[PDB]
Design a protein around this ligand. Structure first.
Ligand code: NAG
Ligand code: NAG
Lengths: 339, 334
C-alpha cells in the first residue's frame, strides 16, 4: 500500500466500482481526494465497497466528499434519511424560535453526517451560508434564511451536529451567492455591491464559521466588480487578502469545477489565486491531461488542511451508533421535517 | 423606418437606454427580438422609453421578452406587483384544492402580463412546466408541483391569465428539466415512456391549448438521443413537431464558434437562437450571417406579439377588478 502525500486535485469516478484505469489514475501523486455523485450510488453496500476500495489504494487515504445539503441537493437517496431543505430550519426559526431551530439543525447535521460516515465518506459539502435575498433561484431554498444572524447561528448548530457524526463543515459560496440572480445554468453573474455592504451581511456567517472551526470553503462563481474584476474563485483579493489575511481562515479553499484555454492553465490560475485544491469533475480526460507532467505547487499547509477533513469516527463505531434508539429517533425526526 | 423581416436571433442590451452601437446592432437583419434583464431596468417610465426606442428602429417591430416567472425569477421589481414563486400555487393546490389554486394562477398570470404589457413588453418566458421531482436546484421553487396533473392544470390557468394581459406563453424546459440534478451538462437516464407518463404531459397539453413557444432543456436523455434536447432533431422534429404537433417557436439554449453552435441549433429544429450577455458573439454571429430558410418564422414571431394596445392596458389597470387582482397577488408574495 504505497505511502503518497495527498495531492492538490480532487477528481471523481464514473460509476459504481473502480475500473483499473481509475485505480491507476487515483494513484497519481497529483490526486488527494474524490467527490462522489448520484451516478456512483446504487445502494449502501455497494457504496461501502466503493469507498473501501478507494481508501485501500494509498495512504494517507484519499479524502472522499459528497454534496449532501438537504432538499434538492442530496446525492444518495435510497437507504438514507431524506433531508429537509435548509430553509425549513429558517422557517422553524421564524415560527418556533431560535432555540427550537438550533436543536433541529443539530439533529439534521447529526443524521446527515452519521449516515454518510457509515459508508466511508469523510465530508459533506455543507452548509450553504448564502443569504436569501430573494434574488437567486439556484440557491433558493438551499439558504437557511434572509438574516445573517439566523444563517450564522443555524449554520453553527448544524456544524456541531455534523461533528457528532464525524464530519467537519464546508461553507458555500464565499463570499456570498445570495444577492445575484441565477436561473440560467452556467452564466457568470455580477454582484455590484460594495465590500462594506457584504461585510455588513453576506460575509458575516463566513467570518463566524471560520472562527468556529469550519474546515473548508467553496467560492462563488460570481464577480464582485467593486472588489475585483475576477470571479471570487480566481481572485487573490478575495482569497488571500480577504479570506486568509483579513478573516484569518486557515482551512481548505476549494476551486470551482474547472471543467478550453487548457486545464493546466485553469488549474495554475486557481492555485495562484489562493485555492489549495482544484476540483475536476465529470472529465477524467482532463484529469489525465492535468496530471501528466504536473508539478505539485509548494503548499506546506496542504497536508494538514486535508487531514483536518478526515472523518473522526471509525466504521464499526458508526454502525454501532446507528443501531441506538437515540440515533433512530433523530432519523425519524429529520425524516419528518422532510415530509 | 426600415422594413426588415424579423431575423432568427434574439439578442439583448447593456443598460437602461440604447447606445448608438446597439441601435446599429439591432438593425441587423439577423436579429428579430430582444430579451431584457434586471440591468435594463431603472423604473417604469425609463422602461417604456427603452421599449419604445427598440420598437422604433424597424418594422415589424422587434419582439421584446423578459423572464417574469415569479419569486426569485422576476427581473423588474420597483413599480411592479411582487410575484409569488410558482410553487406557492402548488402549495395552494395541496392545501385549499385545485379550484382555489387555478383561480389564484389565473390572477397571477393576469397581473404578471398586464403590468409588463403596459411597459411595451410582448412576452414573459413563462411558465415553467418542469416537475418538482426534488432533484434540481436550478429549477427549485420555479416548478409548480411534483404532480404532472397539477402542473398542467396550474400552467393552463396561468396561461389564460397571461392571455387576458395580452401575452402568449412559453413552456420551459422541454422535454422536462425536473428530474436531473442541477446545482455542466446533466444526464436524465429515463426512458421515453417514463417521460410520456409524467414530464412530457404538461407540454402536450399546453401545446394543444395554444402555447406560443418552448425553451429546451440543456439536458441529455441518452435513451432517446445522445445530444442535448436543444440540439436534437429527435427531440425537436420527431417528438415535439411530428408526434406532439407543436407549431410555435422553438427557442435555442443560450448559446453562450458561435456560428457553428447556431448552425447546429437551427439544423436541430430551433426557430430562434438566444445569445445573451455577449454582444461580441452577436456581432461575430451576424457578420456574414446567412438567414436559414424558414417560411414559418414570420408567423411564429408574429403570434407572440402583444395583443393589447396601450390604451386598452391603461383602461384595464384602472378597473377595480384588476386593482383587486394586484392586491391578491401581492398577498401571495408576502
Ligand atoms: C433556467 C434555465 O434552465 N434556463 C434558462 C431559461 O429559463 C431562460 O428563459 C433563458 C433566458 O433568460 O435562460 C436560460 O438559462
Ligand atoms: C450549486 C452551486 O451554486 N454550486 C455548486 C456547489 O454547491 C457544489 O458544492 C460544487 C461541487 O459539486 O459545485 C457547484 O456547482
Amino acid at each position: 500500500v504505497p505511502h503518497i502525500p495527498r495531492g492538490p486535485v480532487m477528481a471523481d469516478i464514473a460509476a459504481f466500482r473502480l475500473t483499473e484505469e481509475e485505480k491507476q489514475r487515483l494513484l497519481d501523486p497529483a490526486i488527494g481526494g474524490i467527490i462522489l455523485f448520484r451516478r456512483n450510488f446504487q445502494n449502501i453496500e455497494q457504496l461501502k465497497t466503493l469507498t473501501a476500495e478507494i481508501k485501500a489504494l494509498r495512504t494517507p487515504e484519499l479524502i472522499i466528499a459528497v454534496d449532501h445539503e438537504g432538499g434538492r441537493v442530496q446525492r444518495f437517496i435510497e437507504g438514507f434519511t431524506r433531508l429537509p431543505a435548509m430553509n425549513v430550519l429558517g422557517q422553524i426559526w421564524d415560527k418556533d424560535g431560535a432555540s427550537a431551530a438550533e436543536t433541529a439543525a443539530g439533529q439534521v447535521g447529526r443524521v446527515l453526517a452519521t449516515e454518510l460516515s457509515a459508508c466511508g465518506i469523510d465530508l459533506s459539502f455543507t452548509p450553504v451560508l448564502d443569504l436569501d435575498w430573494g434574488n437567486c433561484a439556484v440557491i433558493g431554498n438551499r439558504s437557511f434564511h434572509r438574516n445573517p444572524e439566523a444563517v450564522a447561528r443555524l449554520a453553527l448548530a448544524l456544524q456541531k451536529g455534523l461533528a457528532k457524526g464525524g464530519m467537519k463543515s464546508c461553507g458555500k459560496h464565499f463570499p456570498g451567492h445570495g444577492f445575484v440572480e441565477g436561473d440560467s445554468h452556467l452564466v457568470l453573474p455580477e454582484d455590484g455591491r460594495s465590500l462594506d455592504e457584504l461585510e455588513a451581511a453576506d460575509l458575516a456567517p463566513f467570518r463566524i464559521m471560520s472562527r468556529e472551526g469550519m474546515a473548508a470553503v467553496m467560492p462563488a462563481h460570481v464577480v464582485y466588480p467593486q472588489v475585483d474584476t475576477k470571479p471570487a474563485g480566481f481572485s487573490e483579493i478575495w482569497l488571500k487578502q480577504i479570506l486568509r489575511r483579513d478573516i484569518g481562515f486557515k482551512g481548505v479553499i476549494f476551486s470551482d469545477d474547472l471543467t478550453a484555454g487548457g486545464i493546466k492553465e485553469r488549474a495554475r490560475i486557481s492555485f495562484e489565486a489562493g485555492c489549495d485544491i482544484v476540483l475536476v469533475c465529470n472529465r477524467p480526460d482532463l484529469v489525465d491531461e492535468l496530471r501528466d507532467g504536473f508539478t505539485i505547487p509548494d503548499n506546506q499547509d496542504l497536508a494538514g488542511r486535508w487531514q483536518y477533513m478526515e472523518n473522526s469516527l471509525g466504521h464499526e463505531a458508526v454502525q454501532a451508533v446507528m443501531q441506538t434508539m437515540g440515533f433512530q429517533a433523530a432519523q425519524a425526526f429529520v425524516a419528518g421535517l422532510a415530509s
